[PDB]
Design a protein around this ligand. Structure first.
Ligand SMILES: *[C@@H]1O[C@H](CO)[C@@H](O)[C@H](O)[C@H]1NC(C)=O
Ligand SMILES: *[C@@H]1O[C@H](CO)[C@@H](O)[C@H](O)[C@H]1NC(C)=O
Ligand SMILES: *[C@@H]1O[C@H](CO)[C@@H](O)[C@H](O)[C@H]1NC(C)=O
Ligand SMILES: *[C@@H]1O[C@H](CO)[C@@H](O)[C@H](O)[C@H]1NC(C)=O
Ligand SMILES: *[C@@H]1O[C@H](CO)[C@@H](O)[C@H](O)[C@H]1NC(C)=O
Ligand SMILES: *[C@@H]1O[C@H](CO)[C@@H](O)[C@H](O)[C@H]1NC(C)=O
Ligand SMILES: *[C@@H]1O[C@H](CO)[C@@H](O)[C@H](O)[C@H]1NC(C)=O
Ligand SMILES: *[C@@H]1O[C@H](CO)[C@@H](O)[C@H](O)[C@H]1NC(C)=O
Ligand SMILES: *[C@@H]1O[C@H](CO)[C@@H](O)[C@H](O)[C@H]1NC(C)=O
Ligand SMILES: *[C@@H]1O[C@H](CO)[C@@H](O)[C@H](O)[C@H]1NC(C)=O
Ligand SMILES: *[C@@H]1O[C@H](CO)[C@@H](O)[C@H](O)[C@H]1NC(C)=O
Ligand SMILES: *[C@@H]1O[C@H](CO)[C@@H](O)[C@H](O)[C@H]1NC(C)=O
Ligand SMILES: *[C@@H]1O[C@H](CO)[C@@H](O)[C@H](O)[C@H]1NC(C)=O
Ligand SMILES: *[C@@H]1O[C@H](CO)[C@@H](O)[C@H](O)[C@H]1NC(C)=O
Ligand SMILES: *[C@@H]1O[C@H](CO)[C@@H](O)[C@H](O)[C@H]1NC(C)=O
Ligand SMILES: *[C@@H]1O[C@H](CO)[C@@H](O)[C@H](O)[C@H]1NC(C)=O
Ligand SMILES: *[C@@H]1O[C@H](CO)[C@@H](O)[C@H](O)[C@H]1NC(C)=O
Length: 1382
């Protein structure tokens, strides 16, 4: 006879080689086989062999033709021979496959100020590199807007390397990535960038997390640590209790040796064992400090349990089918409390309703019994196990059983002739390169394969992902009668991916009996990599050598990362399992694939009313609904058989189925290629940070594949001799500060040390007369200190030193030849600044000389009551009119930034100045690069304030329903500045749509949102906003056909009779110049020209604020910021004329000289909204006046001699000439000769001691101590009061900046508390100044309060200053003093 079997997967994978296995047996004459995978048109030739005598088990390769959409095909088998011929036809589905794109994100957690290092990898379905082209690689901020994009990223070796710096702001959240490709669909990825906050404490506690009722002691192992690993002396108090139904205890302790508290808590006061239960013991632990009153609180709940003993079923062994004659292996796992093994115990197993086993455990709660399954013909067979011991404490709560109990429900396994195969499953990860010997048990009954032959062959098959690999045959000699086991020599290799399913079957005479399991294989990646450093230990500035080897001809990307991250976010992208799980169809399940059943029709149902004469009684057929046989053993692995033998159970009708570390950057990111066998040496330089240096790589090759390293190589860099200095940021003149130098020894031998401070003449040092050579040893640190007099000015550097005379063997034993000399000197910086506040006085001038000479003097007069020693006289020359605001673009104004409008002053005038430079043939490559960098940084900073509604608002920390004016400003600036840097079009579209929806048409006028920007225009706020919206629309390159623009022009047309405001008239003039008009613009500017204020050679427009024209109630400040904006629009409008005539160039000069007069030493004029417009107008005006050569030589003289002889030319046209007068009270006179226009600026810088003598913006600051001890107080509390006493309608956004009291620091929790509370819109700290942005300050006094810690202690502390000023009008300001509470 002929018995045959095809084994093929049901779902073939297109384009990759698979295997088909054939199992012919029984025949005697030679045969001729043919297997064809009938595609649409072509015939494949899987087998075309001449088969010869019996036992033909061969499994042959074939290539699946590539197909783009899953399609069903047939497999035909022919057995043509001399005798019987067999024809068979099964069905399979050929499926398509994509290519996989992966993102390697090194440094899993990111912080602001870092560099995100991409890596795109494209792979075939088999892990091989392919060339891939990308078109839409870009990032996305948590707000959902694209930040950066790359175009046409071509892959060189299947890997694309990208970099992206992250701005110092870096809005915390989860940035995402999109990487669209010609084959991939979306290679999405995520970030976990978090705000870098470093709390001064970190408390560590590890509760048992579960306590039994019969427990009397609860032990706590709690400690606390600083940020940099220092002990925290103080008091730790812990209070724990619980509620009862419908008592508390508390203990305290002290620490200090190293930081540790063994907080034993007795449960006797607690009602453990009584009705005062709540199943949860709450615990609150608080740690404090002796000096500072700051405390850290940590609360956790400890579970209260009652089930002391637990018995469970391990669902790895203990299969769900029972076979006749094969013992059923019952394995029970016994654990107590928090999952601990048990000693010798008896678990009683009930088979059906009677205990049969009484199994003793194996000293680890791993008990096993062998239920004899012979003569079981039932269909359910529920086995139950229990922990019967009438001594344990088992008081259940949910009215459950009184002893641990588990139940397992099984099924019956069918086989026609009577024979069964079982495979002893494995519950461990099988390693690569090792032959394994999985065991198979078999019952092979009589009346089956045939008595008289004591030999049986069991065929053997494995399935890795969707393909058959490692076929085999194991033949057994039946020396005994019918039972036993044999070993399967499986050869696990890298070609078996995770999840390899094993199949063993035997074909007896008419029955094919098969059993399958689901082995787990470790991930080996068919490649080998041997990343390894050349030394585990080294100094902090050593030359690290790295020796990597892999498969020949491999492109191989390396990475070295601080492992401090892996203790925070242990989720590495591109792990050993992510790659493998990114593979389609790695474990077939059934026959339903792509909407195709692939299942042959069921056989006919046997009639259940036909009697049977079996032994002596009539019988009737019966079949279980839920059962298992060979067919359900397959159809689960996924194979397709075509055997003649029976593989399905019979069925009868009527019974159917129915962040705490300062980790540094990755210092190598190379992508090296491997030459020959592979001995590449990667050489880099280690950074200074003292951490771990775990190294990994992914190492692809076009021939074999890539192998990720398994155990990352580890490196450690440390300094044997540590010296550290702690200093405050700034100090006050003639103040006695103490220096604290920590010297530490990490050598195994005890050492001595001598430390010396280099004396200097700039600053004096108090001779402390302290000298002790402490015999410090391993794990120790000293606290040598010195007294420093701050009798100097400005920047001073402190240098410490060491000599390391040690006598290593303790102190008595001489070192001899053990060490020679260790040198470690650390530089430190200090800035001493005179007492008082800073003041400036700038008088800029423009010189227009045509072969003439100018001898203007310098009119400088230091004010009376001035601090001596703080005085400097400064002179600035620039070769171009708009030349100075080029080196100071990022710091155009000294004001603190952080609001929406404030931020649009470091990127708003840069497009205009760049356009001016490009137009007057002066742009340079590096200057353009710097301008682009500034623009891009500004875009990153400003993108943070965007609301999801599409509108832009200030104070992202305190959102309020968007701000229409700020949205218009940001939209206009982005549209103007999208020529150079990348700008998302969706963001502009969304903001424009928000402007669309912001109709709110009060009569014919638009209405603006927010109430903190046009606070000075009065009731005309709507008209002013409409005019500004029109200005933005015109100068964003929009024609007058838009609906918003047409409506705005219609609104502005009917405004001449009303709108008697000199602020609104300027806006209307500018918009009617932008919309080129001859009559309306002309008559409006003719009206405005009448109200011009004339000075000596300069013309400008005052605010014309008739309401309250006085000088005492805060109206004396002459430099009103408002008039600068109006004059700048006036200059812009007159410049944007039809043809500037000779009678109008003089007007240009007379309006520009005054405007350029109000320019500070940095470029900013008066405020952000003013300096932006002033710079734009100055750029446009200087566009119309330019000299090719512009010869200028300038020299400054005094009554004693000539200071300097500077020269200005084309080469010296964009760099600023800076000079300092040696004498601050001299008699100086400058001289400029040549032709052209130049700027000369003379400034005086000094200090004044808080001139609080007059009526102003009333500010009063005072303080209280809380922890005042022996003089200096550890914690301070500042409370300030602000009130407004001027004559204005309402006030605008105001800032109060407080200078910290010498060497103190801001209390970040207190500042954050002020931020969360709704009194200050935003709080910021930098360089010992804290800025608080108040939205408004009314006549009613506003009181604020916040705390301040102590850093480096200092005595003889002088006063500090609190300064309040309106951000948009610095004329109304107030000063207040601040003193130490003690
Ligand atoms: C090729 O396949 C066809 C079915 O399309 C079938 O006749 C047979 O398997 C092959 N015939 C020839 C002539 O190769
Ligand atoms: C498959 O069988 C054919 C029969 O002639 C044989 O020549 C071939 O080497 C076998 N293997 C492959 C991969 O074709
Ligand atoms: C713990 O706090 C409670 C507060 O009710 C107090 O009564 C008790 O005295 C405290 N424990 C100690 C040891 O002081
Ligand atoms: C913490 O570690 C173990 C675990 O509780 C304990 O034996 C040890 O005594 C504890 N150490 C301290 C300092 O409490
Ligand atoms: C099997 O049949 C018995 C008969 O009463 C029934 O109690 C049980 O719930 C069924 N199922 C299992 C898994 O034992
Ligand atoms: C598995 O067991 C068989 C028993 O004879 C032995 O021959 C073989 O070497 C074993 N394989 C191992 C231990 O890897
Ligand atoms: C297992 O497979 C590997 C890879 O082909 C081979 O090198 C090794 O010799 C095999 N082991 C045995 C025992 O055949
Ligand atoms: C590389 O190492 C060598 C000696 O090991 C030496 O040149 C130096 O330490 C390293 N190179 C640089 C540039 O630091
Ligand atoms: C953290 O980063 C580096 C150390 O590698 C250092 O330059 C920087 O100042 C550190 N910042 C803080 C706050 O410690
Ligand atoms: C390196 O560190 C890893 C961290 O888990 C560790 O498993 C490994 O044993 C260490 N050593 C080497 C040589 O990888
Ligand atoms: C500038 O100084 C030179 C002398 O160095 C003098 O001859 C000349 O007339 C002055 N003026 C101009 C416009 O060159
Ligand atoms: C400028 O000159 C005037 C004389 O008109 C004098 O009063 C004043 O002190 C000088 N300095 C300043 C800064 O105004
Ligand atoms: C400068 O202006 C010219 C004039 O069209 C333009 O082609 C060029 O791109 C501009 N350069 C820059 C850097 O914008
Ligand atoms: C925008 O500028 C382009 C010049 O690049 C100009 O052709 C166009 O008319 C302007 N306006 C609009 C609405 O495109
Ligand atoms: C012009 O400036 C250059 C710059 O080095 C230098 O020759 C000198 O200062 C000037 N030469 C003159 C004034 O002849
Ligand atoms: C400073 O120069 C001016 C020039 O007129 C004049 O007052 C006098 O020569 C000098 N004054 C002094 C030195 O006080
Ligand atoms: C300032 O504006 C307010 C707006 O409510 C109004 O009282 C008046 O027009 C002005 N004067 C005073 C004193 O408020």
């Amino acid at each position: 006879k002929v018995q045959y079997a095809l084994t093929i997967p049901a779902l073939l994978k297109s384009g990759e080689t698979q295997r088909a296995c054939v199992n012919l047996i029984g025949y005697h004459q030679p045969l001729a086989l043919s297997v064809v995978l009938e595609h649409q048109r072509v015939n494949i030739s899987i087998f075309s062999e001449k088969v010869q005598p019996p036992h033909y088990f061969k499994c042959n390769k074939f290539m699946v033709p590539t197909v783009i959409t899953n399609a069903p095909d047939f497999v035909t088998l022919s057995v043509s021979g001399g005798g019987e011929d067999i024809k068979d036809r099964k069905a399979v589905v050929i499926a398509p496959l994509n290519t996989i794109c992966l993102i390697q994100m090194d440094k899993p957690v990111y912080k602001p100020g870092c560099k995100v290092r991409f890596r795109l990898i494209s792979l075939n379905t088999m892990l091989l590199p392919i060339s891939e082209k990308y078109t839409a690689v870009y990032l996305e901020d948590p707000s959902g807007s694209r930040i950066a994009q790359w175009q046409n990223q071509e892959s060189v070796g299947g890997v694309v390397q990208l970099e992206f710096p992250l701005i110092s702001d870096a809005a915390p959240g989860s940035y995402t990535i999109t990487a669209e490709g010609e084959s991939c669909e979306s290679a999405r990825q995520g970030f976990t960038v978090d705000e870098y906050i470093l709390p001064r404490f970190s408390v560590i506690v590890d509760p048992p997390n579960t306590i039994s009722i019969l427990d009397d002691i609860l032990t706590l192992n709690v400690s606390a640590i600083y940020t940099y690993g220092q002990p925290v002396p103080g008091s730790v108090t812990i209070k724990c209790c619980r509620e009862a139904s419908s008592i508390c205890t508390n203990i305290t302790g002290e620490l200090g040796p190293d930081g540790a508290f063994y907080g034993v808590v007795s449960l006797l006061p607690f009602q453990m064992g009584q009705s005062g239960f709540q199943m949860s013991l709450g615990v609150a632990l608080t740690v404090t400090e002796e000096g500072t009153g700051i405390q850290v609180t940590h609360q956790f709940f400890i579970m209260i349990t009652s089930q002391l003993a637990t018995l469970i079923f391990d669902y790895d062994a203990l299969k769900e089918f029972y076979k006749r004659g094969i013992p059923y292996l019952v394995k029970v796992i016994l654990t107590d409390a928090n999952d601990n093994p048990m000693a010798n115990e008896q678990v009683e197993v009930e088979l059906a309703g009677k205990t049969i086993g009484a199994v003793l455990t194996d000293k680890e709660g791993r008990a096993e019994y062998a239920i004899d399954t012979s003569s079981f013909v039932q269909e359910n067979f529920t086995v139950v196990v229990s922990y019967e011991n009438p001594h344990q404490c088992y008081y259940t709560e949910w009215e459950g059983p009184d002893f641990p109990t588990a139940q397992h429900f099984v099924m019956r396994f069918y086989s026609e002739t009577g024979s069964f195969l079982d495979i002893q499953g494995s519950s461990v990860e099988l390693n690569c390169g090792q032959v394994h010997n999985i065991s198979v048990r078999y019952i092979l009954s009589l009346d089956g394969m045939g008595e008289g032959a004591t030999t049986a062959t069991f065929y053997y098959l494995a399935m890795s992902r969707a393909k058959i690999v490692q076929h085999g045959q194991r033949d057994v000699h039946l020396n005994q009668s019918k039972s036993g086991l044999f070993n399967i020599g499986l050869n696990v290799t890298s070609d078996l991916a995770p999840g390899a399913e094993l199949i063993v079957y035997c074909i007896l005479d008419l029955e094919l009996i098969a059993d399958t399991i689901s082995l787990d294989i470790e991930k080996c990646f068919q490649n080998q990599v041997s990343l390894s450093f050349s030394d585990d230990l080294g100094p902090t500035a050593s030359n690290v050598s790295l020796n990597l080897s892999a498969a020949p001809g491999s492109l191989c990307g390396v990475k070295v990362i601080d492992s401090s991250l892996l203790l925070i976010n242990p989720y590495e992208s591109l792990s050993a399992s992510g790659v493998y799980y990114s593979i389609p169809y790695l474990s077939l399940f059934g026959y339903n694939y792509g909407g195709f059943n692939l299942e042959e029709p069921e056989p006919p149902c046997e009639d259940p009313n036909t009697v049977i004469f079996c032994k002596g009684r009539y019988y009737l057929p019966v079949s279980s609904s839920t059962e298992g046989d060979t067919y359900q053993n397959l159809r689960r692995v996924g194979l397709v058989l075509g055997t003649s033998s029976k593989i399905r159970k019979p069925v009868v009708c009527g019974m159917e189925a129915k962040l705490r570390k300062n980790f540094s950057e990755t210092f190598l990111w190379r992508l090296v290629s491997v030459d020959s066998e592979g001995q590449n040496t990667i050489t880099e330089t280690v950074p200074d940070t003292i951490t771990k240096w775990q190294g990994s790589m992914f190492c692809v090759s076009e021939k074999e594949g890539f192998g990720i390293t398994k155990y990352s190589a580890n490196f450690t860099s440390f300094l044997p001799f540590f010296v550290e200095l702690s200093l405050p940021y700034s100090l006050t003149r003639e103040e006695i500060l103490v220096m604290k130098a920590f010297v530490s020894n990490y050598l195994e031998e005890c050492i001595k040390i001598i430390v010396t401070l280099q004396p200097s003449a700039d600053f004096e040092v108090i001779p402390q007369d302290v000298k002790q050579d402490q015999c410090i040893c391993s794990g120790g640190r000293s606290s040598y200190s010195w007294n420093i007099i701050a009798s100097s000015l400005g920047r001073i550097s402190f240098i410490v030193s060491a000599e390391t005379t040690h006598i290593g063997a303790s102190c008595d034993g001489p070192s001899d030849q053990s060490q020679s000399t260790r040198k470690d000197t650390v530089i430190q910086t200090i800035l001493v600044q005179p007492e008082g506040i800073r003041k400036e006085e700038t008088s800029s001038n423009l010189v227009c000389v045509e072969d003439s000479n100018v001898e203007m003097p310098i009119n400088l007069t230091l004010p009376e009551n001035i601090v001596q020693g703080s005085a400097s006289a400064f002179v600035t020359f620039v070769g171009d009119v708009l030349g100075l605001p080029l080196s100071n673009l990022q710091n155009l104004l000294q004001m603190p930034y952080g609001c929406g409008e404030q931020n649009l002053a470091r990127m708003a005038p840069i497009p205009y100045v760049l356009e001016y430079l490009n137009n007057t043939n002066q742009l340079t490559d590096e200057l353009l690069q710097t301008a682009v960098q500034f623009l891009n940084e500004g875009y990153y900073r400003q993108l943070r304030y965007k609301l999801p509604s599409g509108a832009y608002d200030a104070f992202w920390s305190s959102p309020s329903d968007g701000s229409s004016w700020l949205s218009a400003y940001t939209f206009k600036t982005f549209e103007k500045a999208k020529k150079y840097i990348y700008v998302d079009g969706k963001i502009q579209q969304q903001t424009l749509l928000y402007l669309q929806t912001s109709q709110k048409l009060d009569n014919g006028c638009f209405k603006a949102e927010g109430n903190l920007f046009m606070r000075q225009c009065g009731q005309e706020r709507d008209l002013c906003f409409t005019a500004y919206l029109a200005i933005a629309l015109l100068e964003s390159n929009y024609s007058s056909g838009m609906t918003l623009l047409d409506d705005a022009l219609g609104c502005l047309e009917a405004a001449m009779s009303s709108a008697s405001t000199l602020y609104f008239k300027s806006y209307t003039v500018y918009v009617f110049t932008l919309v080129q008009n001859w009559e309306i613009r002309n008559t409006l500017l003719n009206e405005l020209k009448s109200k011009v204020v004339s000075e000596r050679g300069t013309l400008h427009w005052e605010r014309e604020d008739k309401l309250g024209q006085e000088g005492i109630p805060l109206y004396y400040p002459n430099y009103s910021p408002a008039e600068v904006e109006i004059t700048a629009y006036m200059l812009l409008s007159i410049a944007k004329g039809s043809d500037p005539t000779h009678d109008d160039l003089t007007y240009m000069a007379q309006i520009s000289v005054w405007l350029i007069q109000q320019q500070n030493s940095y470029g900013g004029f008066r405020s952000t909204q003013d300096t932006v417009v002033a710079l734009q107008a100055l750029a446009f005006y200087a566009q119309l006046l330019f000299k090719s050569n512009a010869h200028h030589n300038v020299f400054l003289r005094s009554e004693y001699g000539d200071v300097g002889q500077l020269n200005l030319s084309e080469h010296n046209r964009l760099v600023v000439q800076r000079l300092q007068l040696p004498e601050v009270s001299g008699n100086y006179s400058i001289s400029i000769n040549g032709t052209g226009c130049c700027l000369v600026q003379s400034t005086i810088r000094y200090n004044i001691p808080v001139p609080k003598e007059n009526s102003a913006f009333y500010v009063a600051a005072d303080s209280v101590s809380k922890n005042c001890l022996n003089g200096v107080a550890y914690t301070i509390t500042i409370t300030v009061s602000v009130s407004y006493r001027g004559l204005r309608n309402e006030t605008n956004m105001v800032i109060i900046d407080i200078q910290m009291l010498s060497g103190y620091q801001a209390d970040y929790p207190s500042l954050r508390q002020l931020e969360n509370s709704q009194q200050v819109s935003k709080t910021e700290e930098q360089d010992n100044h804290v800025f608080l942005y108040l939205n408004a300050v009314p006549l009613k006094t506003i009181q604020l309060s916040f705390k301040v810690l102590i850093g480096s202690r200092v005595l003889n502390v002088k006063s500090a200053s609190v300064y309040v000023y309106d951000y948009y009008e610095t004329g109304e300001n107030g000063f207040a003093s601040y003193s130490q509470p003690c």
